[PDB]
Design a protein around this nucleic acid. Structure first.
Lengths: 70, 77, 92, 522, 99, 82, 73, 75
RNA sequence: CUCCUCAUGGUCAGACUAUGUAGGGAAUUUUUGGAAU
């Protein structure tokens, strides 16, 4: 997970919503902080710019490498 | 302004009939007297009854050990 | 000493069903939370009921535009999480 | 088709031979060899005692593995000799497949004679203990004069460099020898086998050295028993203590026995103490005793090791129960139960019914059908019911009958000298009358899972349950039908004292006959 | 003992993980964390129409089950931790043997 | 403790937005954040999944019930880059 | 105090039935044993779904987490 | 185990929203490390119109694990 | 691989960091599911 640091990552939430953001840090619970994170729902449609977000590790399903770091 | 475990203990001593709201289930709630409990809030409940709200009917269950995880809201009736 | 007590409690507790399954190499059927069932032999187990199962036959129920039909498949080497277990039944 | 794989190899003209086999099957193999049906026979090392005369012999590998050593070790030149005696011609042919390091060793000591040496220097502690117990050696002078008879003595003179005695001379020998025996004596007095006091010099024997020397158990094993065994010890601990001994050095392991021990440990009643080593032969002894108590289907490899263990254990378990008696702990009861379990092969709580020879689950159920609990109810049974219960072969039925007959229903009675006059700290003699159902023709003990023969014996026990103190014990061989035995035992302190007497057989389980009585001591 | 260690053994293995949400995963395990968090590479993933992904990290609690290859040696992989525990746990008369 | 817990403690005194497991969104000034993610919030504007919006003075929600937070961009500078 | 653990210990070796949170399944059988985390083992078990007998399962293990309550029958 | 700092909410009337879209109003009385709460003058607000006074002086206990959120009615 | 605990060696006035034959990561706020339909 440390290799994934600073990367743009796609996290899939428990509810099925898709969040995309830079992975700045994690912890034991897999609580993630995501910089410049935006949300996509259906697939672009229903995309929103959230900004800096924490996500809970209990809600996270999976993460994938989206793009390279800024 | 009393801890909840002490509240449950006064239910224990008073032997008042107790109504428990379960978790994520509005349809049914369980009722009966608290004869004892543990640290996990598992409760031995005597003359317990299932109370479907959906006039209310119910099923007499006799003695029961109810697990504390179901517990949403403990009350007196 | 503590280790001994844990193994013993495991032996005489409800866990005895999955212990007996591993030692006798007997098939057991597991009702899971996905509404799927796994009849198989227990290769390994865990306190969480994590399991290594061999000769897995999983049975499920599917609904279509007519009568409900049962479906089943064979998975020879299956490893299972411990929380999906609703029930582990041991039978003849 | 016994020896489950002996079929397919032997079918193509190569036979299999190893210890532990079905004997019939082995004999068939041998007959094929003699008649020429099998031209080739593969014999395991331990079967060198079975001498099958050959025209030629091949020896494949000089290295055998033992776990205890934790590496392969080459064969004894003795084994190789017993391995070359089999072959004779038209010309005697012996192929020996060896390493380069072992070539010079075998190529010399097989063709040229074996130089003989003496290993006494290792066992001197036990040997000298034995001499002191027999009280032939009254003093240290006496022991040196006793060491004059040793093949060791002659040897240390002709080749002193082998034994580490640097000085070669009459005085040098004397000094070195006296050094050795002095070290021995310090170990014995420290371990409480003996005691030494100045007035030439006087040496006396204690309760530990008595039993150790009598049963012949080695010094080190006894010292280990002493260190581990205390009061309030459990049956598991006693069994561990039994497993840790030097007598089990002769039980072989190659890598499979140990891995299989791990796999077997799921199925066993007990669990080895965490602070000792698994690879050590002690753990294996432990699990094979477990497999003796629970009758598992053992590999034929492990059957032999079980047999070896059983050949050792009876003296050892006797020492275990007696050493606890010497330390005056009432828990010797559990040691007695364990000894019974070793003679028979069943647990105390699991079932008394399984004790009777050749019982299995189904047959036991019929006993529950007739609602029998103890074995004594089988003695009152008559022939028609027995026929209904056991449908089996005639030899097995006969052994069961012999079991029933020689297993006595014996009654425990006591007669005390004076119940009114009871003084504290005095040697109080009791006369216990014991009486037997049938007078024995011979004392043979009958058990299937314990192949070796045993004579029956008994232990008379007096102690108080709450304090966990055993006041008195004695061993008896009851040949007659009715006898009397006098326990000379010191009385406890003043006041009311519960005294419970057991009559516990060394062999047969569920023979425990008890009578409880209490006396007020002044 | 701990089956998670058995999963730790499974690096470079091609597996199909069914998940509690019903998702099917197919890929080569690069590692599994003790949390049973599984990082995989060359993964085709089917949500309940397959998406091809270079790397996928899955949180352990979401894993329903993992289907292993039939070629795997379970006898060998299952017995480790006991041997490790034994390793962590670990006089004249020495030579029963002679000359 | 968690590094994101440390950031979230830095977020105290700022205006944050919170989405709970139910889906309701609470925007307001974060008074207090415990280690367990329990948060005390002020002058909250709340948007329900149905779209209705309400105003409340003081709200405190359990950690376990929070889906996620959005915190101001000021904190992104440091010191979590290390 | 009479705790759930002693009541359950006294309930061992008796015919019981257990209603799971789903209520989709109830199990009536002899209570063989229960562990410290409160998993359940029953013998001769019978399954009652929707209050009707589904079938006779036999020796059965119930994950603790699914148990809503246990009652003596 | 950490204790929630609820002391500021003590003896204040609060509206708890709880799992299953349930809502109750009552004065905060006790709490513990577990976030389990004792409420006095508890009033259930049912989905329809009405509200029932469940515990006027007899109070009640709510499992902290079931507590979704808590609103302070007072300041 | 990660977090905690513990131990530890160091540094600062309990905290931080390297290492560990260590313990651990199923009973309310996260990883042994209230989900299923």
């Amino acid at each position: 997970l440390a290799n994934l640091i600073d990367y743009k990552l796609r996290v899939l939430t428990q509810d099925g919503r898709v969040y995309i953001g830079q992975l700045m840090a994690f912890d034991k619970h897999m609580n993630l902080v995501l910089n410049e994170c935006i949300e996509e729902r259906v697939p672009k449609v229903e995309k929103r710019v959230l900004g800096l977000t924490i996500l809970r590790g209990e809600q996270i399903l999976s993460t994938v490498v989206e793009d390279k770091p800024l | 302004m009393v801890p909840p475990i002490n509240c449950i203990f006064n239910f224990l001593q008073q032997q008042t009939p107790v109504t428990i709201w379960l978790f994520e289930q509005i349809g049914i709630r369980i009722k009966g007297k608290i004869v004892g409990f543990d640290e996990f809030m598992n409760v031995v409940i005597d003359e317990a009854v299932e109370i479907p709200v959906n006039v209310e009917k119910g099923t007499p269950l006799g003695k029961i050990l109810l697990k504390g995880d179901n517990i949403t809201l403990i009350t007196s009736a | 000493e503590l280790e001994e007590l844990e193994e013993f409690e495991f032996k005489h507790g409800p866990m005895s069903l999955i212990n007996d399954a591993m030692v006798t190499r007997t098939p057991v059927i597991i009702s899971l939370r996905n509404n799927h069932k796994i009849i198989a032999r227990v290769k390994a187990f865990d306190r969480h009921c994590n399991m290594v199962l061999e000769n897995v036959k999983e049975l499920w129920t599917e609904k279509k535009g007519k009568n409900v039909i049962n479906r089943e498949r064979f998975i020879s080497k299956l490893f299972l999480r411990g929380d999906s277990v609703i029930v582990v039944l041991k039978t003849p | 088709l016994t020896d489950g794989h002996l079929r397919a190899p032997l079918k193509h003209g190569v036979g299999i031979l190893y210890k532990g086999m079905a004997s019939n099957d082995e004999r068939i193999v041998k007959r094929l060899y003699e008649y020429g049906a099998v031209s080739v026979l593969l014999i395991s090392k331990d079967c060198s005692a079975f001498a099958c005369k050959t025209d030629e012999v091949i020896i494949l590998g000089t290295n055998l593995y033992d776990g205890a050593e934790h590496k392969y070790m080459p064969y004894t030149i003795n084994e190789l000799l017993e391995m070359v005696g089999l072959a004779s011609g038209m010309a005697g042919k012996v192929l020996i497949l060896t390493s380069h390091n072992m070539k010079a060793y075998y190529k010399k000591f097989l063709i040229e004679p074996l130089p003989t040496e003496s290993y006494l220097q290792y066992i001197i502690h036990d040997t000298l203990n034995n001499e002191i117990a027999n009280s032939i050696i009254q003093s240290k002078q006496d022991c040196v004069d006793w060491f004059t008879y040793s093949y060791f003595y002659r040897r240390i003179h002709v080749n002193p460099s082998y034994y580490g005695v640097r000085d070669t001379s009459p005085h040098g020998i004397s000094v070195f020898l006296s050094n050795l025996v002095e070290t021995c004596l310090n170990d014995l007095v420290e371990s409480s086998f003996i005691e030494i006091d100045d007035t030439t010099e006087i040496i006396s024997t204690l309760s530990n050295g008595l039993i150790a020397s009598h049963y012949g158990v080695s010094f080190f094993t006894i010292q280990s028993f002493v260190s581990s065994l205390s009061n309030t010890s459990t049956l598991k601990n006693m069994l561990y203590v039994l497993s840790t001994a030097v007598e089990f050095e002769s039980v072989p392991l190659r890598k499979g026995d140990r891995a299989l021990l791990v796999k077997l440990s799921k199925r066993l009643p007990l669990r080895f103490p965490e602070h000792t080593s698994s690879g050590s032969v002690s753990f294996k002894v432990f699990l094979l005793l477990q497999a003796y108590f629970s009758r598992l289907e053992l590999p034929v490899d492990f059957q032999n090791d079980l047999k070896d263990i059983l050949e050792k254990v009876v003296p050892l378990i006797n020492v275990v129960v007696d050493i606890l008696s010497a330390n005056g702990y009432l828990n010797a009861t559990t040691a007695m139960d364990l000894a019974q379990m070793l003679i028979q092969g069943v647990w105390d709580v699991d079932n008394p019914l399984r004790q009777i020879p050749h019982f299995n689950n189904k047959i036991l159920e019929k006993c529950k059908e007739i609602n029998v609990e103890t074995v004594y109810d089988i003695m009152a049974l008559e022939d028609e019911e027995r026929d209904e219960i056991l449908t089996l072969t005639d030899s097995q039925l006969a052994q069961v009958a012999a079991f029933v007959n020689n297993y006595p229903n014996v009654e425990l009675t006591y007669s005390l000298n004076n119940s009114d006059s009871l003084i504290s700290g005095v040697k109080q003699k009791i006369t216990i009358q014991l009486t037997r159902d049938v007078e024995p023709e011979n004392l043979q003990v009958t058990s299937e899972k314990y192949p070796f023969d045993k004579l029956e014996s008994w232990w008379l026990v007096l102690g108080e349950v709450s304090k966990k103190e055993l006041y008195a014990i004695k061993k008896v061989t009851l040949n007659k039908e009715t006898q009397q035995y006098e326990l000379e035992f010191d009385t406890p302190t003043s006041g009311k004292h519960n005294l419970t007497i057991w009559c516990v057989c060394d062999s047969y389980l569920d023979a425990d006959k008890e009578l409880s009585f209490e006396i007020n001591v002044k | 003992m701990k089956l998670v260690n058995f999963l730790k053994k499974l690096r470079n293995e091609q597996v199909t993980i069914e998940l509690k949400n019903g998702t099917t995963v197919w890929g080569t395990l690069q590692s599994v964390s003790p949390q049973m968090n599984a990082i995989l590479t060359d993964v085709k993933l089917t949500l309940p129409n397959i998406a091809s992904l270079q790397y996928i990290n899955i949180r352990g609690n979401t894993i329903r089950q993992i289907i292993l290859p039939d070629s795997l040696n379970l006898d060998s992989l299952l017995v480790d931790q006991k041997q490790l525990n034994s390793l962590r746990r670990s006089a004249n008369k020495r030579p029963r043997r002679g000359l | 403790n968690g590094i994101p817990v440390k950031l979230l403690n830095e977020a105290q005194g700022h205006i944050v937005s919170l989405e709970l497991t139910t889906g309701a969104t609470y925007r307001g000034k974060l008074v207090e954040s415990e280690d367990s993610m329990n948060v005390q919030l002020r002058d909250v504007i709340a948007t329900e999944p149905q779209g209705a919006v309400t105003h409340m003075d003081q709200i405190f929600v359990r950690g376990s019930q929070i889906k996620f937070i959005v915190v101001p961009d000021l904190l992104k500078n440091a010191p979590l880059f290390k | 105090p009479v705790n759930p653990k002693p009541f359950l210990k006294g309930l061992v070796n008796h015919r019981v039935g257990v209603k799971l949170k789903f209520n989709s399944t109830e199990y009536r059988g002899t209570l063989v044993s229960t562990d410290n985390y409160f998993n359940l083992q029953l013998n001769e078990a019978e399954e009652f779904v929707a209050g009707v007998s589904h079938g006779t399962l036999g020796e059965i293990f119930i994950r603790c987490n699914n148990v809503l309550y246990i009652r003596e029958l | 185990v950490s204790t929630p700092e609820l002391k500021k909410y003590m003896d204040k009337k609060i509206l708890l929203n709880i799992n299953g879209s349930r809502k109750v109003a009552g004065i905060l009385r006790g709490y513990d490390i577990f976030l389990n709460v004792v409420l006095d003058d508890a009033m259930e607000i049912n989905g329809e119109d009405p509200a029932n006074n469940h515990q006027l002086g007899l109070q009640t206990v709510i499992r902290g694990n079931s507590i979704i959120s808590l609103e302070a009615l007072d300041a």
